[PDB]
Amino acid sequence: KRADLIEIGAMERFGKLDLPKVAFRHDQHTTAVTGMGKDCAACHKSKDGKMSLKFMRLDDNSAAELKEIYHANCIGCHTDLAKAGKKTGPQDGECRSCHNPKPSAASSWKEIGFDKSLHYRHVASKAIKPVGDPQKNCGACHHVYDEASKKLVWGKNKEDSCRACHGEKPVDKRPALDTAAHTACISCHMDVAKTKAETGPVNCAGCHAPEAQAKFKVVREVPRLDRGQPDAALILPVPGKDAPREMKGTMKPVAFDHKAHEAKANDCRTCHHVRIDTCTACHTVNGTADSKFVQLEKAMHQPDSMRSCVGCHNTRVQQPTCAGCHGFIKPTKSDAQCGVCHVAAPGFDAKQVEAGALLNLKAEQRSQVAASMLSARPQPKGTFDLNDIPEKVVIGSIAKEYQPSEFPHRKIVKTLIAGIGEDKLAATFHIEKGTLCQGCHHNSPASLTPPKCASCHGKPFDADRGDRPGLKAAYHQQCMGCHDRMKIEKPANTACVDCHKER
Ligand code: HEC
Ligand code: HEC
Ligand code: HEC
Ligand code: HEC
Ligand code: HEC
Ligand code: HEC
Ligand code: HEC
Ligand code: HEC
Ligand code: HEC
Ligand code: HEC
Ligand code: HEC
Ligand code: HEC
Ligand code: HEC
Ligand code: HEC
Helix, strand or coil: CECCEEEECHHHHHCCCCCCCEEEEHHHHHHHHHCCCCCHHHCCCEECCEECCCCCCCCCCCHHHHHHHHHHHHHHHHHHHHHCCCCCCCCCCCHHHHECCCCCCCECCCCCCCCHHHHHHHHCCCCCCCCCCCCCCHHHCCCEEECCCCEEECCCCCCCCHHHCCCCCCECCECCHHHHHHHHHHHHHHHHHCCCCCCCCCCHHHHHCHHHHHHCCCCCCCCCCCCCCCCEEEECCCCCCCCCCCCCCCCCCEEEEHHHHHHHCCCCCCCCCCCCCCCCCCCCCCCCCCCCCCCHHHHHHCCCCCCCHHHHHHHHCCCHHHHHHHCCCCCCCCHHHHCCCCCCCCCCCHHHCCHHHHHCCCHHHHHHHHHHHHHCCCCCCCCCCHHHCCCCEEECCCCCCECCEEECHHHHHHHHHHHHCCCHHHHHHCCCCCCHHHHCCCCCCCCCCCCCHHHHCCCCCCCCCCCCCCHHHHHHHHHHHHHHHCCCCCCCCCCHHHHCCEC
């Protein structure tokens, strides 16, 4: 179980290896060289104040130069160590002990990233001094390339994840993500270490061991990370540069409570999966090569993505307090439900306006329109006064093998409501007083007087073919299914008499 394994194979670049690649355990090496009184410089060279992540060179010049670099420096240390009686590595004649095919695995490595709590601990840190702003420390970490001064500069309000510009491999001036991260994070972690203030880790396991990550202090006291995003955004059906038509849209546009969404999410990137910007710069109505022709409709409504409005919302719906109802019902895809998001802009018919004219507005003007949209929504409707519903229901129309079932209708509804508690997805998407009722009274209008299940679930007569569930099967599927999705302990589905006593 290691998080610090590296497979050394730089040579493959120049041709097929004669021998296996060389497993190397970096934390085993660093533990040992520190104890010998040495540091990173024992194996990495520097230039311009920057440590190279490569072993004992600035460049991969030839096959022959790397092979000599490794043997001469890797072995040389193992030799001196053995000649001194210390614990050590493979010696010069031990080819297969370095060049070893077997290491199947034993890798526990894991990606690391900044959630909002870990990003705050860096901002709020006194060892990371402000720069270019009396109060702000953003420029200690974030940059953009300034063509004018031919150099990196802190772009105020242009901060983004490193992933937005640093990818899988280098793109000539900008390093790939791993070297970016390893160069910036570790080197500051080591400066701050010299002043014995609190710091971040430098051992590989320290960032990459699952156990280490679990140990990090987490903070739910997280202030708004604030570059200059809007509180209220106006999302639009964007046609895109290359579209024969330039067609408006088909729906009304959608105001979006950006500030509230921030406070509920874990970072920015979950939504802005490529870079902070609109979504429409790439996901247009018809899609674009920048999305990979993934169209705006897929981006905003896709059922199983955490990135989309519908998709993220779908995962909140699996939480037990919700899933009783949400695992049973089907969607109406009704115009009222679409209209929870697609609303009227104040003062005009957005459908008669091209995207461009709204995108071209100044951010503060567009925010004001969305805000007005947001503010005009209908207040939460709530459900019926539970006193207008039967406190108890006895279900006995097919009683036989057992007595009829006495069921605590009203108490169960209050608990559903209590479990929903303050959740705002539910308060706004539960659009009719009887919406909650439809969690069990499916397929009929929201109402104080829903019909009985028998009104349309066959009496109990077909052992073989029966269009949707007969009566008994529908009660059992509804009652027992909710109890399991909600993790209700009692009654238990095996406890027949707890829902209907015998006789
Ligand atoms: C997380 C906040 C980030 C880290 C850590 C780094 N970046 Fe960047 N970066 C960007 C460009 C265009 C370059 C090339 C600059 C040039 O033309 O010389 C870089 C370079 C780096 C480097 C190399 C430093 C060196 O002198 O060799 C490091 C270590 C690095 N970046 C770390 C651009 C961007 C960017 C575009 C918007 C973002 C979001 C980031 N970098 C984020 C991070
Ligand atoms: C002092 C504590 C350090 C720090 C901060 C780093 N190392 Fe090393 N390192 C060594 C070797 C053989 C490699 C593989 C590169 C190659 O073969 O050319 C590395 C690599 C790294 C990385 C990159 C990790 C990755 O796989 O992406 C990093 C971030 C790194 N080093 C930092 C060898 C050694 C040593 C030889 C005994 C010593 C000592 C160190 N490294 C020390 C450090
Ligand atoms: C015992 C004498 C040998 C022999 C015959 C070879 N090695 Fe090594 N070697 C080491 C490392 C890290 C490399 C680079 C790995 C890579 O980038 O792929 C090498 C390289 C080689 C090569 C060239 C690559 C190839 O497979 O063609 C060859 C032919 C080679 N070695 C032969 C490291 C070590 C050791 C670490 C201490 C030890 C011991 C050895 N090598 C020993 C030998
Ligand atoms: C000590 C030498 C190591 C070694 C061997 C590795 N890491 Fe790191 N690393 C860090 C971050 C932020 C990234 C970007 C990817 C991510 O977000 O987790 C990486 C990337 C790597 C890779 C590349 C994996 C890939 O397939 O893209 C590898 C092999 C890797 N690391 C190994 C963060 C850290 C640390 C934060 C302080 C430190 C310490 C390390 N890594 C150290 C090492
Ligand atoms: C000063 C207050 C700021 C502001 C306004 C921002 N940062 Fe950071 N930031 C840092 C790193 C390593 C990341 C990448 C995290 C990852 O991919 O795991 C970020 C990310 C951001 C974002 C996008 C947030 C996201 O969802 O990923 C934004 C909008 C942002 N930053 C703004 C690193 C640092 C620092 C290093 C110690 C510090 C200081 C800052 N950032 C400071 C700020
Ligand atoms: C795509 C851009 C959208 C749109 C149009 C909406 N969301 Fe979300 N949402 C999420 C969570 C956790 C909640 C409840 C928050 C709380 O309890 O305070 C919500 C709530 C809403 C609402 C109701 C409140 C409101 O702002 O009006 C609405 C109308 C709404 N959402 C619209 C979570 C997410 C996501 C998780 C990653 C993502 C993606 C989205 N929402 C995306 C969208
Ligand atoms: C334990 C596994 C059992 C067994 C053997 C049965 N049930 Fe139930 N059942 C429930 C409800 C609300 C009804 C409708 C009652 C009515 O309209 O009279 C039923 C119906 C049945 C029947 C058919 C009716 C009859 O009496 O013949 C049978 C044979 C039956 N059940 C067997 C509800 C529940 C539960 C509530 C969640 C639980 C638990 C069970 N039943 C468990 C069992
Ligand atoms: C939201 C406030 C409501 C309202 C207004 C009602 N219910 Fe229910 N209810 C449920 C079941 C399984 C039955 C028995 C149906 C049958 O046996 O055919 C009932 C019964 C009712 C009635 C009586 C209807 C009748 O004519 O007998 C009424 C007026 C009624 N309900 C209103 C189950 C549930 C739920 C399961 C968890 C939930 C939620 C609700 N009901 C919610 C509501
Ligand atoms: C009284 C509350 C009930 C109960 C307990 C159930 N129904 Fe219905 N139902 C109806 C139709 C047309 C179907 C076919 C499937 C569908 O269209 O959703 C169903 C299906 C069910 C199931 C099975 C669901 C599954 O996902 O496999 C169950 C457990 C169930 N129902 C229970 C139609 C209606 C009504 C039409 C007006 C009425 C009223 C009810 N059902 C009432 C109830
Ligand atoms: C001293 C400066 C070292 C240099 C440079 C390299 N290695 Fe090493 N190595 C060193 C020590 C003190 C040890 C033993 C560590 C321990 O805790 O036992 C090692 C060990 C290895 C091993 C053996 C792996 C194992 O026993 O579990 C290998 C395969 C190894 N070293 C490879 C290796 C390579 C490939 C190096 C250059 C890349 C290298 N070592 C340099 C000390 C030093
Ligand atoms: C200075 C400019 C830093 C850079 C850039 C990065 N880190 Fe950092 N980190 C720094 C400090 C001063 C601290 C201690 C903060 C405190 O007061 O608690 C940290 C802490 C971390 C931690 C905490 C680990 C823990 O023990 O809980 C982690 C995991 C961490 N830093 C990771 C990290 C990464 C991945 C970075 C680049 C992507 C990075 N840090 C940059 C200082 C600085
Ligand atoms: C939030 C949870 C949404 C719900 C529910 C629905 N839509 Fe949606 N849709 C949403 C956003 C943020 C967007 C992008 C903004 C815009 O108005 O363009 C969309 C976009 C569409 C589109 C494509 C553009 C257009 O045709 O106007 C379509 C066709 C669309 N929306 C249709 C649609 C329907 C039919 C819905 C109910 C069934 C519906 N959306 C719900 C966000 C949300
Ligand atoms: C280019 C700069 C984009 C921006 C801006 C946004 N998205 Fe994207 N998206 C992009 C690509 C290239 C892809 C496919 C490649 C990939 O990463 O999958 C996507 C895909 C999506 C999806 C579908 C996910 C799936 O499982 O296939 C969604 C739901 C999505 N994108 C949402 C989305 C949102 C909400 C954006 C603004 C916050 C956004 N994207 C911007 C490219 C780009
Ligand atoms: C039964 C009592 C319910 C519980 C408990 C919760 N929801 Fe619900 N919800 C219910 C119904 C009958 C509907 C109507 C479905 C339709 O499409 O007409 C809904 C609707 C929603 C929706 C949006 C519609 C959808 O996209 O599925 C959302 C986003 C929603 N509800 C959220 C939500 C959450 C977060 C809940 C737990 C907190 C929750 N609902 C509970 C019935 C019931």
